[PDB]
Design a protein around this ligand. Structure first.
Ligand SMILES: COc1ccc(/C=C/C(=O)Nc2ccccc2C(=O)O)cc1OC
Ligand SMILES: N[C@@H](CCC(=O)N[C@@H](CS)C(=O)NCC(=O)O)C(=O)O
Ligand SMILES: N[C@@H](CCC(=O)N[C@@H](CS)C(=O)NCC(=O)O)C(=O)O
Lengths: 198, 198
């Protein structure tokens, strides 16, 4: 299958798709665009948003929708339909929280104040829920890695850019990040991927 | 299986689960809670959010995660791998918009303002994207009803509460709503369900 992924030059909402392609050893074109080429591309898109994935010429949209499509019938999906539910739920929980950030805010002082308050109150609350949910287990769901573990490592990587000490009291969540980063297809991808802030 | 769904006395985010139970002819306890009891239940839940679905003593969370679990291997799921991706994608597009609403906002004047702007400035574009996407087809995805059709009807119902003229220029989207509402199991639920504003 000929896969082509389109997004900005950043990890952002495309990174989960990139980890999945990497882990499943599926080749694809990692097409990254700059602001200048957005209006042209955007207009051809039914919903006007990226990422999009073209599969043998057919366009797919919605990053989590695409992530799930790529993990279908693989062990990254969750071993049972019940585990798949828990995987989807954790992914949505993380996405709901990531969506609270005013990423696009133009007023820098407002952006700073909002980031600080989300990182001071909400983030440590979520971290406790995540930590107790994982408990002393190896992975977030079941007994093998799922894309929910991937998403966690991805979201936390971005949160750590803004509050480096966020996981200072959560060694089990740090250990989870290290387990994910250590998967060889993931360690490789992380080494060769373009370096960007987000 | 024993199913117990807990949410507020509202269609809201539990409604998609209710339509799915109805269509699949599954009995469940439709548990509805008052606001004053929420803080107490919230504290015992791994992630402090509703709806939750209890199955044989296992808690599930996240409405879409649950909806997806319930429709897996049923005729409400897409017919192909790729069609299931489109079902997921349409649902997420609708969810991304519904999430923008400050449902819980304390300040009335601020809340009204937010709602007005989203409905007046944003909603029209989603409708336009949806209308073009549907085109002249019968259902949003493929040749038969999916839970993406249920979600569209559910989201549109709530939006029409606040902006009744929202679909005046979109007869094909009105037709799809009517078509979902005509499904016997759906029509029966709509007729018998508690009548709430939201
Ligand atoms: C103030 O308490 C309230 C009051 C109303 C609501 C939500 C009502 C509703 O219809 N929501 C939706 C309906 C359809 C699809 C998606 C949503 C969605 O919210 O994502 C929630 C509250 O708790 C936050
Ligand atoms: N939930 C959607 C969000 C899509 C989205 O808002 N993408 C952004 C980039 S992170 C975008 O294209 N927004 C800019 C625009 O619409 O012009 C997804 O994960 O794909
Ligand atoms: N994406 C989640 C959102 C969960 C959510 O925000 N639900 C609301 C009710 S609609 C809630 O539990 N809020 C009450 C609170 O925050 O205390 C889902 O679909 O279930």
């Amino acid at each position: 299958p000929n896969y082509k992924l389109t997004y900005f030059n950043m990890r952002g909402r495309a990174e989960i798709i990139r980890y999945i392609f990497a882990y499943l050893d599926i080749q694809y074109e990692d097409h990254r665009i700059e602001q200048a080429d957005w209006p042209e591309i955007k207009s051809t898109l039914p919903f006007g948003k990226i990422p999009i994935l073209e599969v043998d010429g057919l366009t797919l949209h919605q990053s989590l929708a695409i992530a799930r499509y790529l993990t279908k019938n693989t062990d990254l999906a969750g071993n049972t339909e019940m585990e798949q539910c828990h995987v989807d739920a954790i992914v949505d929980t993380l996405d709901d929280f990531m969506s609270c950030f005013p990423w696009a805010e133009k007023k820098q002082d407002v952006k700073e104040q909002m980031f600080n308050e989300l990182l001071t109150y909400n983030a440590p609350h979520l971290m406790q829920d995540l930590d107790t949910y994982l408990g002393g287990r190896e992975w977030l769901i079941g007994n093998s890695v799922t894309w929910a573990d991937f998403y966690w490592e991805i979201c936390s990587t971005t949160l750590l850019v803004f509050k480096p000490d966020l996981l200072d009291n959560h060694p089990r969540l740090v250990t989870l990040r290290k387990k994910v980063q250590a998967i060889p297809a993931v360690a490789n991808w992380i080494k060769r991927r373009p370096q960007t802030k987000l």
